Amino acid sequence: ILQHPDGTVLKQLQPPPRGPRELEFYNMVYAADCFDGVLLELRKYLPKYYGIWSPPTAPNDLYLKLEDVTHKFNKPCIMDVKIGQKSYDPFASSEKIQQQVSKYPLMEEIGFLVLGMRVYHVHSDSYETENQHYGRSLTKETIKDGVSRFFHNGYCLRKDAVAASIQKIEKILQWFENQKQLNFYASSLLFVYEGSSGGEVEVRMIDFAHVFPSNTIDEGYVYGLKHLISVLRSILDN
């Protein structure tokens, strides 16, 4: 992810088939002649899409030009959470499934995985960062405290941001419960709140290299959202 001063990010397409698939996802959603109510509503929850981009001198080098969801914040606190019970897709090989489940074997049980967070601390004027190993270390016993960490500025628990996060996730859940045409594997929610202008929060869906047509509710994604909501709700009682 490359941040551009103009309030956009450039995401380099992943190798095939992942990058092409994400391009076609955005292209389908933001299709100019799209009157599909499901896809029109979904746009609210994605980064705004500015189409494919490549350097003037390098047509080979493919990027998606996307809204930088963090742009409007002064000291953005950012958390990326992978959603779902399965991070492999319906066409994965046996080896691929094993690879994906081994990366985090609690995915079925918990239904989400914290990919990372960056938290601004007021008293130190500094950021705490957690990498992929943080979230992959979390269990049923430690997931609540693991998530809570995102909302600690080093003096208070930001229950305002927690409550706002629940409310915005709920709208995404409502979208999922009113569509049976897309299933999303290994996709994420990006959480942003203001670390320095009170209860201001972004929660957006990102990373669409494994989105597939479906005839059914995305039960795994729904489960993940429900559990994440439940965890956030309990944090409100801290």
Ligand X SMILES: O=C(Nc1ccc(-c2onc3ccc(-c4nnn[nH]4)cc23)cc1)C1CC1
103 is in an annotated binding site: yes
Question: How near is the Cβ of 209 to ligand X at its closest, in Å?
Answer: 8
Structure tokens at 201: 């929060």
Question: How near is the Cβ of 9 to ligand X at its closest, in Å?
Answer: 5
Q: Residue 153 in contact with residue 124, Cβ under 8 Å?
A: no
Decide whether 164 or 206 has the Cβ nearer to ligand X. 206
192 in helix, strand or coil? strand
122 is in an annotated binding site: no
3 is in an annotated binding site: no
Q: Which residues of 184-221 are buried (b: 16+ CB within 10 A; e: fewer)?
A: bbbbbbbbbbbbeeeeebbbbbbbbbbbeeeeeebebb
52 is in an annotated binding site: no
Residues preceding discontinuities in the chain at C–N > 2.5 Å? 196
Beta strands in the chain (DSSP E): 2-4, 8-12, 49-53, 63-67, 76-83, 112-121, 126-130, 182-184, 187-194, 201-206, 211-213
Question: How near is the Cβ of 64 to ligand X at its closest, in Å?
Answer: 8
Question: How near is the Cβ of 141 to ligand X at its closest, in Å?
Answer: 28
100 is in an annotated binding site: yes
CA distance 226 to 15: 32
CA distance 19 to 202: 25
Question: How near is the Cβ of 70 to ligand X at its closest, in Å?
Answer: 4
Decide whether 162 or 190 has the Cβ nearer to ligand X. 190
Decide whether 1 or 216 has the Cβ nearer to ligand X. 1
Decide whether 69 or 225 has the Cβ nearer to ligand X. 69
11 is in an annotated binding site: yes
CA dihedral of residues 88, 92, 94, 98 (deg, nearest 10): -20
Per CB under 6 A, residues contacting ligand X are 1, 3, 9, 11, 47, 66, 68-70, 78, 118, 190, 206-207
Decide whether 69 or 169 has the Cβ nearer to ligand X. 69
CA distance 183 to 206: 14
101 is in an annotated binding site: yes
**Binding-site annotation, residues for substrate:** 18, 82, 96-103, 132, 210
**Binding-site annotation, residues:** 11, 18, 67-69, 80, 82, 96-103, 132, 207, 210
**Binding-site annotation, residues for ATP:** 11, 67-69, 80, 207
